[PDB]
Design a binder for these strands. Structure first.
Lengths: 158, 133, 257, 50, 286, 53, 247
RNA sequence: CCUUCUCAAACAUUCUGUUUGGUAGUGAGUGAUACUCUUUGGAGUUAACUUGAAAUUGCUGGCCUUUAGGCGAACAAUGUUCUUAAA
């Protein structure tokens, strides 16, 4: 998680003030007398879902604390079915920091600068080894059967 | 069953015997830490072995660092089967060259060059090339 | 709170933008209602000057910053330069705590204490959180009082800092007073040129000599990268002197005092 | 292969058009004196605060 | 030095030998079978006991990269040129300027990179190798070359065409396009690079046998050998195509003759600086 | 319906660099920033020429 | 707990710094023996940085000068090697935010190229020297009867007369004279004053102080530049303004 | 979870030219043609090719100074030491 947010923090979208300043500089240049495509993290639930089913997202971070949890329950399954790497990241307020929003349910990386192409591939492999291949058998098991002390003392022992 | 020896692979630059020992001594007492290096020049081969005094310490050291993303590398730590000693991993250093020789006298050394030239000239005759002098 | 939120989110450009768009309070109306007239300001200028001269001779630490001390020192130097220019010093008293100067500002007697220029030992007991507020009030009080005093006398305010003369001694003489007596003390030392030696503190002696009508050729001022032509006196503090050239009068500092 | 065969729009390959319109709106506002250019603003904050 | 007739006959014999007599594309053995090489050996190492990553530029009468680029039209790999420049001089020159002052002579600079590009976008080993291995001539700024071995790696310096050539781009301590263009032309059509090893054997790549005429090759050999004779103590010179027996050209035995207290304690200069900053003089001398 | 100043400058540059070759103005990455078909380029350039001469 | 990345970073950075020091030392050894045949450059360059920030690249004379060296925090993730630590130890510069007066000569110059990343150097003015001595003056003086190692402030000239009176120094202002102009007794008073305790530029971790730290570090990439090369010039800056910040 | 030697001279005016010096690499693995020396043990060189920053253990090279350093530096030389990059 600490290595994932080092790559995702280098493609943070411009804030309103920075974008306004950049546009006003161009406007002031024009008023007196050929650029490459930008790169940023993709967010928004519908936008990221549309990206996933078009096979454009290279890595999708899904928050684990969406209050209407049904907004993201289909997302790991859609990512696995469509062959898109995904990771469940702890904290929806932390995904919004790299988005300049208070919260963000999801985040995604579609295109990356050529300097960070190797880092994204290594991160995808790391998540595949640490997250996908590690939890793919226990992911499909019912959870939450934790027993309290006053209950485990009288059931497990007896 | 298992041994107390863990094999670590995909090590970054600058993570050598001393660094490996210093990091892995926090998981328990160590008995041997060796790193693979090139013989001709002392340079990490990016893998090594190290043995714990406690066999059950190697399992914990393997479960927590088997997929560690460090310096852009995915560390590969795995415990070896029963037995499987570690040996023959010397700590080589960069080999400087020594300029020694010219034991033969200059007369014989100069006379051998002429006969080498003649034999070289005669050699190419049998290879479908005509060359004079 | 908003700046803390800005930094905590990892967005530094917005934090800089927030700090650019901020305005602090001003104590102008408070000073006006505390002192409806200039004489009341001259009445409280005593303790105002005491606090400022304490902060002027003080090392910068975690709580009190370098800029605060620099502002206090600038105010103190401006005040000393004005008092020396107008020749208003009436009494002086050298004590074990510092030097007390009493001047005649607009018909009022103003007495302030200047500590000796020695390293200070800051006690952890004291609360600089209160002294900083007191200094913040006193600095504005002096800003207004100094503007009024300079403009009533026809001088230009704020005085221009002579960066060349500031690099050698950095005192009251560093400020040049452009434009646009009634007491015998202001006439003393008129036809005198003093050669201030190294031993005697130049800061508390050049001010006293200039405020009477004298001229100072400090010996400590020739250490950077004259030849004593018109000197008539020399202030020494060595146990034994070396040259003893004829013509000059050799004195100890207390004579001036 | 993806779910649908919708063609790729042409706006994903060429520079932004909404930003072009916004920049031209700012240009029109600058020419009318409603927006002071950043250089002139930087000039005005180095002349009064004394 | 070497009589012209011997070199002419050697080149003719190599041409005859190289072509004595299913596959779509020629393999490595067939592709570079006709490459010509001049072996020069002296007594003792060429560059002393220190490794030298700099290329010696030997003057040639006929251009070496012109037939290369001309014959690269019908080859799978194009002849590209890389120009490595300083960080501050990367904006003073554009592709249009080099196009204006280089197309009139036939030279095309394919890529212009900075030293900052070698540590951000070509940092990864695979990307760096893929980028570097597509160039046949790498011209590096004179100031930046000395820090290149770390930024370009060691695989770049295992070949002669992938190792940078140091060219001057500064006139009167400022960047001038005229100096850069003149040096580019000079290297392109007046010189040939060669690595100086710390052994006795040195190899000069004279180019493919199909590029220049046999007389154009003998005229370059006669000059390169003369320069190497003047510059070093070389004892023998051979000529060969690749995977061919060496043909002797030069032979010189006459070189083998060169193979057989109190305060002041005379302390070193570092200790001389140490003694000036510490009063308790307590050096551990004797 | 008259053209704008910036459009006229863009068509100026296109005509001065390529002339009446619409296929090259279509494939030019520096002047055809918004990749526009040959028909649109021809129509706008014809309007510009008609207005100017 | 010590994470692996810290250890790897320390090893890599210290290995780079050690190679830098070895290169500088070999170059200075070659220049000292007048063996300047296969060296990059034989000239002792000095770079003067002044603030809109201009650079002067001038050849150093043999003339002695007066420098005030301030001990700043060195490169991150670097353990100080033996050479640099030895030089800083004889200079009594191990505590950060600490300054010392040194006399630059032909032999001091090679030392400044070894400890360059750990210090900031420049020539102070008379006002800076006077304010520095009169605001931060320390001495190791005996306590009541037994405790020697108290480090006390220079409050009176009686202690200076007791200690340095034989050499003719009877007051602090005579130490200022022997330091501003390098005299016969420069060393005696220089090793009597002991290193100065300066004030760090930004001290705090609140939001205002954290952004002050960000702005201060952002300007450090343009003022204290180190080329990591053997022929690197000794960087000299405006010490008067820095001491205005640090006093 | 650090970030890489980004140049110096000497001569001469053809908006610049000539000469000299400065460059130590990720590892593993294919692969010839040839050269020099040899203590005949291999030491230094010579085309070309493959690759996620890839990995499963090559007995111990030699000389010098020691209590790890130099051979790219010899009356020469060695990080776990800075701590407001704090909590």
């Amino acid at each position: 998680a600490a290595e994932t947010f080092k790559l995702f923090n280098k493609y943070r979208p411009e804030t309103a003030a920075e974008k306004k300043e950049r546009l006003t500089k161009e406007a002031a240049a024009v008023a007196e007398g050929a650029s490459p495509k930008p790169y940023a993290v993709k967010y928004g639930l519908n936008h990221v879902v549309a990206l996933i089913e078009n096979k454009k997202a290279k890595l999708v971070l899904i928050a684990n604390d969406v209050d209407p949890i049904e907004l993201v329950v289909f997302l790991p399954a859609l990512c696995k079915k469509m062959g898109v790497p995904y990771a469940i990241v702890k904290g929806k307020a932390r995904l919004g920091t790299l988005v300049n929003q208070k919260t963000s349910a999801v985040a995604a990386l579609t295109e990356v600068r050529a300097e960070d192409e190797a880092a994204l591939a290594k991160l995808v492999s790391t998540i595949d080894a640490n997250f996908a291949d590690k939890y793919d058998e226990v992911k499909k098991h019912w959870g939450g059967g934790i027993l309290g002390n006053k209950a485990q003392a009288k059931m497990d022992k007896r | 069953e298992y041994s107390g020896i863990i094999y670590v692979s995909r090590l970054p630059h600058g993570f050598h015997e001393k660094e490996l020992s210093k990091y892995f001594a926090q998981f328990g007492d160590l008995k041997e830490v060796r790193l693979a290096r090139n013989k001709k020049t002392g340079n990490s081969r990016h893998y090594g072995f190290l043995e714990f005094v406690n066999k059950e310490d190697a399992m914990i050291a393997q479960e927590s660092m088997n997929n560690y993303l460090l310096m852009g590398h995915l560390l590969q730590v795995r415990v070896l089967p029963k037995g499987a000693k570690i040996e023959k991993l010397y700590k080589y250093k960069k080999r400087v060259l020594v300029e020694k020789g010219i034991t033969k006298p200059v007369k014989q050394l100069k006379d051998n060059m002429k006969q080498k030239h003649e034999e070289r000239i005669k050699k190419l005759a049998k290879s479908g090339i005509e060359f004079k002098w | 709170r908003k700046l803390t939120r800005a930094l905590g989110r990892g967005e530094v450009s917005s934090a800089k933008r927030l700090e650019e768009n901020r305005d602090s309070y001003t104590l102008d109306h408070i000073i006006k209602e505390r002192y409806p007239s200039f004489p009341d300001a001259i009445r409280d200028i005593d303790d105002a000057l005491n606090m400022l001269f304490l902060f002027s001779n003080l090392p910068s630490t975690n709580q009190v910053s370098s800029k605060i001390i620099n502002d206090a020192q600038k105010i103190c130097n401006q005040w000393l330069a004005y008092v020396a220019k107008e020749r208003l010093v009436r009494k002086v008293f050298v004590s074990i705590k510092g030097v007390y100067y009493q001047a005649n500002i607009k018909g009022e007697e103003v007495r302030w204490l200047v500590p000796f220029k020695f390293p200070e030992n800051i006690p952890s007991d004291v609360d600089f959180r209160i002294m900083l507020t007191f200094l913040e009030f006193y600095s504005t009080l002096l800003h207004f009082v100094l503007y009024k005093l300079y403009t009533d006398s026809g001088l230009i305010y704020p005085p221009k800092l002579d960066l060349k003369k500031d690099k050698i001694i950095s005192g009251l003489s560093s400020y040049i007073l452009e434009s646009r007596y009634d007491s015998p003390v202001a006439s003393l030392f008129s036809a005198f040129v003093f050669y201030v030696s190294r031993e005697v503190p130049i800061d508390i002696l050049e001010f006293l000599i200039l405020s009477c009508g004298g001229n100072v050729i400090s010996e400590a001022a020739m250490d950077q990268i004259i030849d004593m032509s018109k000197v008539t006196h020399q202030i020494v503090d060595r146990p034994v002197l070396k040259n003893k050239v004829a013509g000059r009068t050799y004195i100890q500092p207390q004579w001036i005092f | 292969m993806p779910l649908t065969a919708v063609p790729e729009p042409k706006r994903r390959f060429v520079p932004s058009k909404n930003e072009a319109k916004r920049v031209m709106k700012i240009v029109r506002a600058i020419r009318e004196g409603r927006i002071i250019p950043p250089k002139k603003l930087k000039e005005m904050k180095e002349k009064e605060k004394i | 030095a070497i009589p012209r007739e011997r070199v002419i006959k050697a080149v003719n014999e190599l041409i005859k030998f190289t072509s004595k007599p299913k596959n779509l594309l020629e393999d490595d053995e067939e592709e570079l079978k006709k490459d010509l090489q001049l072996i020069v050996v002296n007594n003792k190492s060429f560059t002393g006991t220190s490794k030298s990553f700099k290329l010696k530029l030997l003057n040639v009468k006929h251009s070496f990269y012109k037939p290369w680029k001309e014959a690269s039209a019908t080859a799978v790999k194009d002849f590209k040129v890389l120009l490595i420049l300083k960080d501050s001089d990367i904006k003073k020159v554009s592709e249009d300027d080099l196009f204006d002052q280089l197309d009139s002579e036939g030279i095309k600079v394919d890529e212009i990179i900075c030293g900052k590009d070698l540590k951000t976008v070509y940092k990864a080993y695979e990307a760096r190798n893929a980028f570097i291995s597509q160039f046949s001539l790498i011209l590096a700024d004179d100031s930046i070359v000395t820090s290149l071995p770390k930024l370009m790696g060691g695989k770049a310096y295992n070949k002669v065409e992938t190792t940078p050539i140091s060219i001057r781009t500064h006139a009167n301590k400022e960047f001038s396009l005229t100096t850069l263009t003149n040096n580019i032309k000079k290297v392109y059509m007046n010189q040939l690079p060669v690595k100086l090893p710390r052994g006795t054997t040195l190899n000069v790549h004279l180019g493919n046998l199909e590029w220049l005429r046999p007389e154009e090759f003998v005229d370059n050999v006669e000059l390169i050998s003369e320069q190497l004779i003047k510059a070093y103590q070389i004892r023998s010179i051979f000529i060969k195509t690749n995977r061919s027996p060496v043909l002797p050209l030069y032979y010189n035995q006459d070189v083998l003759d060169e193979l057989e207290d109190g305060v002041q304690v005379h302390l070193s200069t570092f200790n001389k600086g140490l003694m000036e900053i510490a009063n308790p003089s307590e050096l551990g001398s004797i | 319906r008259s053209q704008s100043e910036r459009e006229e400058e863009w068509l100026e540059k296109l005509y001065k660099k390529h002339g009446d070759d619409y296929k090259k103005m279509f494939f030019d990455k520096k002047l055809n920033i918004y990749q526009q078909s040959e028909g649109d380029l021809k129509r706008r350039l014809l309007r510009w020429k008609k207005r100017n001469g | 707990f010590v994470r692996a990345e810290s250890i790897v970073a320390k090893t890599l950075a210290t290995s780079r710094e050690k190679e830098r020091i070895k290169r500088v030392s070999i170059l200075e050894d070659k220049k000292a023996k007048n063996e300047t045949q296969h060296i990059a450059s034989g000239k002792d360059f000095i770079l003067k940085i002044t603030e809109g920030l201009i650079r002067e690249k001038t050849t150093y004379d043999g003339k002695p000068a007066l420098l005030f060296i301030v001990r700043v925090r060195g490169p991150l993730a670097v353990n100080i090697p033996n050479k640099a630590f030895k030089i800083l130890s004889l200079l009594r510069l191990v505590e950060t935010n600490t300054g010392v007066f040194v006399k630059l000569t032909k032999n001091v110059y090679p030392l400044l190229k070894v400890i360059a990343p750990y210090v900031v150097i420049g020539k102070p003015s008379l006002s800076s020297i006077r304010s520095l001595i009169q605001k931060r003056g320390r001495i190791i003086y005996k306590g009541e009867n037994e405790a020697e190692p108290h480090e006390i402030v220079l409050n009176d000239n009686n202690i200076v007369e007791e200690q340095l009176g034989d050499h003719g120094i009877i007051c602090v202002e005579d130490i200022i004279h022997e330091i501003a102009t390098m005299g016969e007794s420069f060393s005696v008073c220089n090793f009597f004053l002991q290193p100065f305790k300066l004030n760090r530029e930004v001290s705090g971790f609140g939001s205002l102080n954290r952004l002050r730290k960000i702005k201060q570090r952002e300007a450090e990439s343009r003022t204290r530049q180190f080329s990591n090369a053997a022929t690197a010039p000794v960087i000299e800056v405006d010490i008067d303004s820095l001491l205005a910040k640090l006093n």
